[PDB]
Amino acid sequence: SLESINSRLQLVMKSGKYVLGYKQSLKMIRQGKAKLVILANNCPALRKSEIEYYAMLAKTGVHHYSGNNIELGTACGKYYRVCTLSIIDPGDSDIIRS
Template identity: 60%
Template sequence: MAAKKTGENMNAKLALAVKSGKYTLGYKSTIKSMRQGKAKLIIIAANTPILRKSELEYYAMMSRSKVYYFQGGNNELGTACGKMFRVGVLSILDAGDSDILEAVA
């Protein structure tokens, strides 16, 4: 029950961050934002391929970005962002009004 509640809470924080802050969707733009040092948080879907996930973790370590592993797949992550398409990975550049960065820490 607590895991379900936490997941719903994280979805609400993510939706607020997408609505009020700055973010990038997708693998290439996420790596680009990490290489530039702009990414503060990386959110990876559960069904992301292992090789891609490890590469994202490596870039996150190099750029000192936080990593959050989303419980659902890329369909659920896209829905949580308010998009009508699949999202495998996204990076939060500016959280806006959301406290998602403190919630992950």
């Protein structure tokens, strides 16, 4: 599933609710509003491990995106770069099924 994840991301971007960035992703997972977290592969190792531990506490799925932050950003369609991304809800998608 190379382009399937990208297509799902592009669909949830316009359909559901998302959170770009790290601090307000941490707020969402702490408040339990996050259903899925996506991490770029070049994010700092300590930050990555902290995110996984937080998600293990919150019983939430974490997916390691194949690309780095720049490609994650352009997959999300934003013109900046993002390391950590959160799905509040897909709305109309099957991303959280996988």
